[PDB]
């Protein structure tokens, strides 16, 4: 659970919620987690996506093409979709397997890849970043 998330990882989740709000969405989908990871800017996830050429602009374009926006933004908390819940569950396991009791931004990105089937994965594939390529980039940047 979130007590294990690093400060940056917690911020990724908050950013995902506010990305959804600003798109007038009323759920946090995997694509909002992806946007949150890019927004966070500092962590290993942000650096992995930037180094693959995956930008806020490319992801926003694809999310608008695939999901579009709502008419009216919601207030209060915006619930996770079932797939986003699965991504966050999987992030715990990714972090443990990489030897960490904390969940950092990279483990959220790895859990997103591991789920592999939501809007974020469609976006990444459309932008030319196959999931295995993202996973390899994360591992390579951690190997430094």
């Amino acid at each position: 659970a979130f007590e294990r998330f690093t400060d940056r990882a917690r911020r990724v989740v908050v950013l995902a919620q506010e990305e959804a709000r600003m798109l007038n969405h009323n759920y946090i989908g995997t694509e909002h987690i992806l946007l949150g990871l890019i927004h966070e800017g500092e962590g290993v996830a942000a650096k992995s996506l930037e180094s693959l050429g995956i930008s806020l602009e490319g992801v926003r374009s694809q999310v608008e093409e695939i999901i579009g926006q709502g008419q009216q933004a919601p207030s209060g908390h915006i619930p996770f979709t079932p797939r986003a819940k699965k991504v966050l569950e999987l992030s715990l396991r990714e972090a443990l397997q990489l030897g960490h009791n904390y969940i950092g931004t990279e483990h959220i990105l790895l859990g997103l890849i591991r789920e592999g089937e939501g809007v974020a994965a469609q976006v990444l594939v459309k932008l030319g970043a196959e999931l295995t390529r993202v996973r390899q980039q994360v591992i390579q940047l951690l190997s430094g």
């Binding site: 659970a1 908050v14 919620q17 908390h77 619930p79 966050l88």
Partner: peptide
Amino acid sequence: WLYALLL
């Protein structure tokens, strides 16, 4: 945890 935000 695991409904919305940091819950």
